[PDB]
Amino acid sequence: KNPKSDKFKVKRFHHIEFWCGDATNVARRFSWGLGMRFSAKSDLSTGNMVHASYLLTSGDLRFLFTAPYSPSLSAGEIKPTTTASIPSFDHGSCRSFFSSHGLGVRAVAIEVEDAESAFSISVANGAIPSSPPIVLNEAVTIAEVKLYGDVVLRYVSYKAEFLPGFERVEDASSFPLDYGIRRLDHAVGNVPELGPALTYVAGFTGFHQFAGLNSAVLASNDEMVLLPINEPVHGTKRKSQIQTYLEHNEGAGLQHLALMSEDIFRTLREMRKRSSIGGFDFMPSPPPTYYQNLKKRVGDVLSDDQIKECEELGILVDRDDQGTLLQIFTKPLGDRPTIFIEIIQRVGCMMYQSGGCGGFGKGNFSELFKSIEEYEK
Amino acid sequence: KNPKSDKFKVKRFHHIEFWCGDATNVARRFSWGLGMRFSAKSDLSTGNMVHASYLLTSGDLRFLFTAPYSPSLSAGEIKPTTTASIPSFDHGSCRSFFSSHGLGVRAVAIEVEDAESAFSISVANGAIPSSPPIVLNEAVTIAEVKLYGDVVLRYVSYKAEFLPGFERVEDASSFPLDYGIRRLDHAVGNVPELGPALTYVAGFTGFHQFAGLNSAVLASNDEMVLLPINEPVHGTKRKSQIQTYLEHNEGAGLQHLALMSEDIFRTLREMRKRSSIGGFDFMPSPPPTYYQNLKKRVGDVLSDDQIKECEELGILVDRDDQGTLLQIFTKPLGDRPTIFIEIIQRVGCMMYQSGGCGGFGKGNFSELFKSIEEYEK
Numbered sequence: 001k002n003p004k005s006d007k008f009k010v011k012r013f014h015h016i017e018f019w020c021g022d023a024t025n026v027a028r029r030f031s032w033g034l035g036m037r038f039s040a041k042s043d044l045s046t047g048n049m050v051h052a053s054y055l056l057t058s059g060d061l062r063f064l065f066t067a068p069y070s071p072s073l074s075a076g077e078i079k080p081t082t083t084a085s086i087p088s089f090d091h092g093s094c095r096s097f098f099s100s101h102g103l104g105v106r107a108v109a110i111e112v113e114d115a116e117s118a119f120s121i122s123v124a125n126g127a128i129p130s131s132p133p134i135v136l137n138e139a140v141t142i143a144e145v146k147l148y149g150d151v152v153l154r155y156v157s158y159k160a161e162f163l164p165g166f167e168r169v170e171d172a173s174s175f176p177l178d179y180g181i182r183r184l185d186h187a188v189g190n191v192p193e194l195g196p197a198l199t200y201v202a203g204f205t206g207f208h209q210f211a212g213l214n215s216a217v218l219a220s221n222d223e224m225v226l227l228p229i230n231e232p233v234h235g236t237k238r239k240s241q242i243q244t245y246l247e248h249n250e251g252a253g254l255q256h257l258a259l260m261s262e263d264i265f266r267t268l269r270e271m272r273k274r275s276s277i278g279g280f281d282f283m284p285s286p287p288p289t290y291y292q293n294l295k296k297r298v299g300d301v302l303s304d305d306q307i308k309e310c311e312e313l314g315i316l317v318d319r320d321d322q323g324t325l326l327q328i329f330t331k332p333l334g335d336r337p338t339i340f341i342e343i344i345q346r347v348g349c350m351m352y353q354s355g356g357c358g359g360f361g362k363g364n365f366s367e368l369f370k371s372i373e374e375y376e377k
Numbered sequence: 378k379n380p381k382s383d384k385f386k387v388k389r390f391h392h393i394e395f396w397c398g399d400a401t402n403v404a405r406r407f408s409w410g411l412g413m414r415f416s417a418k419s420d421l422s423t424g425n426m427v428h429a430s431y432l433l434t435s436g437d438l439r440f441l442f443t444a445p446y447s448p449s450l451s452a453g454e455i456k457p458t459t460t461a462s463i464p465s466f467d468h469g470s471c472r473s474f475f476s477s478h479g480l481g482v483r484a485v486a487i488e489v490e491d492a493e494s495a496f497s498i499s500v501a502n503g504a505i506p507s508s509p510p511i512v513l514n515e516a517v518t519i520a521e522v523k524l525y526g527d528v529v530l531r532y533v534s535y536k537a538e539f540l541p542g543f544e545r546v547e548d549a550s551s552f553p554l555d556y557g558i559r560r561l562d563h564a565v566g567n568v569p570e571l572g573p574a575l576t577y578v579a580g581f582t583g584f585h586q587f588a589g590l591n592s593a594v595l596a597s598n599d600e601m602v603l604l605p606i607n608e609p610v611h612g613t614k615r616k617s618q619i620q621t622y623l624e625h626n627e628g629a630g631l632q633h634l635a636l637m638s639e640d641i642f643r644t645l646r647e648m649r650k651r652s653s654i655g656g657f658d659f660m661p662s663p664p665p666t667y668y669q670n671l672k673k674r675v676g677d678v679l680s681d682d683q684i685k686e687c688e689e690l691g692i693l694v695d696r697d698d699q700g701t702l703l704q705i706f707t708k709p710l711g712d713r714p715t716i717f718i719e720i721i722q723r724v725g726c727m728m729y730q731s732g733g734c735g736g737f738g739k740g741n742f743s744e745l746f747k748s749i750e751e752y753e754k
């Protein structure tokens with residue numbers, strides 16, 4: 001059931017912005033680890049005296065990394081005279097965010113038809129304003145409301161290249177890395193209480209519910225914007241990873257970004273080659289019993305050779321009533337056991353592929369558990 | 378003239394510690410960019426609830442990257458019960474350092490015979506104490522005094538593997554990268570006023586003077602610990618890079634680390650291959666006139682093919698009355714135009730090679746200038 005109740009016209013995920021201590025080092029690490037190319041910049045060399053912002057892209061996936069300069073460089077500025085390219089940026093907010101939470105996502109940005117309308121409608125329907133609509137070079141409008149914790153939902157709308165004031169990055173510094181990642185599939189928040197978080201976000205967006213934790217998924221009309229939210233379940237045998245997150249993050253925040261690959265086998269080969277030479281590590285692989293049990297579960301979707309390739313790369317498989325999901329999880333992206341990345345590819349639900357085809361892999365909690373005890377034999 | 382006036386027994390450079398917002402991402406970037414292997418760790422997985430510290434090594438070069446966790450994880454600790462492996466660490470100091478200066482060097486660590494004596498003698502001779510001598514597991518003593526700005530000179534002494542509480546890093550996460558870097562040759566500070574900085578440091582160490590800026594070099598008895606210091610020269614045609622540093626760094630601090638390579642050609646080939654895929658960029662190469670002029674300057678030291686290899690890699694060459702220096706400079710290591718790295722290799726002064734053989738490349742300021750105007754032809 002999709003009641004299509006969006007209160008404003010939403011298109012797709014647009015970008016994810018990380019708030020960093022040093023944007024250069026995080027961006028370079030992420031570029032090599034994920035196969036994303038340097039696409040745009042806004043920094044001292046472009047006249048920005050306030051913040052350094054570097055954009056990585058892979059396909060339609062856009063990762064922005066931002067860090068503040070010394071406030072002294074912009075001490076004579078006021079908002080009407082700012083050299084910042086992202087007008088919502090604030091030195092104190094950024095330093096406080098990073099001190100509190102460490103490296104993590106500040107903004108989940110979605111493209112909308114009209115950021116000013118989306119902002120007004122959101123706030124009229126309960127959204128906590130974070131940054132009012134600001135028109136950039138009469139070409140792009142950006143606005144922000146609180147999503148959960150210190151994460152904002154950013155609306156961006158275009159009259160007609162990332163943002164005004166950003167410069168495209170010269171060829172020599174833009175190595176065309178590509179490991180197959182193509183778009184953001186979903187972005188997941190951890191909160192102390194799921195009910196109030198869902199009511200708030202669904203309240204101001206009109207997003208509907210999509211068919212050690214409790215979780216639920218909010219979706220836009222065409223179910224291409226997907227925002228799962230998790231709460232911890234206390235008292236369990238093993239401590240909830242949601243609760244560990246909330247402790248080390250100092251509260252609610254973005255838990256994982258799921259990145260769709262057009263070839264998850266190639267993506268994982270390339271990322272795993274780089275794990276120990278600057279890239280990302282992956283969670284421990286499932287036991288062989290898990291891949292033995294895949295024949296009964298998805299033997300009609302994946303061949304034996306494809307199942308063996310899943311085993312070689314540590315890939316997990318889950319299945320909907322409609323589609324099949326291939327997924328795998330990185331270890332945390334930074335010092336704290338907080339944010340991590342999921343790589344996914346979906347098969348089925350062809351009409352284009354409908355959003356969320358195959359689900360989110362919740363069935364892999366039991367399948368992993370069963371395979372572990374089975375393997376303990 | 379070397380009066381050998383060290384006030385305590387100094388051995389060699391031991392390590393350099395960077396204070397970071399996220400140690401993981403900086404360390405992984407540096408590992409790939411410089412060819413340094415992950416050698417030791419102190420973090421949540423080793424029982425450290427206070428800071429994350431990761432050690433990279435290449436030969437005798439030791440780079441330590443440290444970032445604070447949430448203070449909440451250690452709120453019940455006091456110094457007598459700390460889980461920090463580096464007892465001088467302080468959350469507030471680290472966050473304030475990074476907020477003020479961005480990514481940069483907190484500690485220049487030298488190995489001494491007795492860190493407690495070195496500390497006492499230093500302070501008795503004018504050093505500003507920063508952290509008193511603390512004995513770690515009855516095996517290692519560490520102490521810190523102020524060097525310049527918020528950089529400390531750290532003394533470490535060993536009774537008889539990096540520091541107690543650090544764990545050696547498992548093989549799988551310790552890829553044996555190596556681009557030829559072998560040790561720290563010198564560490565350079567930028568200050569507003571050279572005179573008072575030299576008087577202070579030479580005052581408490583007994584280090585002697587080694588034979589857009591004014592600079593001088595302080596050296597230990599065997600001239601293996603080398604600490605140049607720069608001040609800006611104001612009013613010049615081009616703005617002093619020392620002054621730009623001081624503005625963007627919010628004052629005095631470490632300007633560059635010079636890393637000795639046992640094969641600077643291999644090091645630069647390997648680093649340049651990685652510049653645009655997560656590693657480090659290099660300053661713009663000299664014009665062809667510079668390499669034409671090398672024949673007259675060092676044609677007795679380097680063959681034509683070796684001179685051409687210098688041209689291929691953008692390497693600079695300078696000459697003492699005793700030796701020859703090959704050097705090259707990276708672009709800044711992070712967002713701010715502050716700290717950068719120098720790669721060097723020295724030829725001559727064989728006895729082992731004596732310290733500072735060939736000088737520090739000051740002659741390359743004029744040689745670059747001349748070659749630029751000559752090339753403008």
Ligand SMILES: C#CCn1c(=O)c2c(C)c(C(=O)C3=C(O)CCCC3=O)ccc2n(C)c1=O
Pocket residue numbers: 186188215216228229230256258283329330340342360361362364365368
């Ligand atoms: C690392 C680690 C441990 N771990 C996971 O984190 C994990 C995750 C994070 C998902 C997932 O993507 C997801 C959503 O997208 C919305 C629904 C709730 C949720 O959990 C699915 C399976 C997982 N499995 C099996 C697992 O073992």
Ligand SMILES: C#CCn1c(=O)c2c(C)c(C(=O)C3=C(O)CCCC3=O)ccc2n(C)c1=O
Pocket residue numbers: 563565592593605606607633635660706707717719737738739741742745
């Ligand atoms: C980047 C950039 C511009 N740049 C440098 O920074 C540069 C440096 C930093 C050195 C150097 O190593 C050094 C010392 O070790 C102690 C003495 C003072 C000093 O400067 C030598 C030559 C240099 N040249 C030619 C140059 O062009």
Ligand SMILES: [Co+2]
Pocket residue numbers: 186188256258342360
């Ligand atoms: Co997911």
Ligand SMILES: [Co+2]
Pocket residue numbers: 563565633635719737
């Ligand atoms: Co130097």
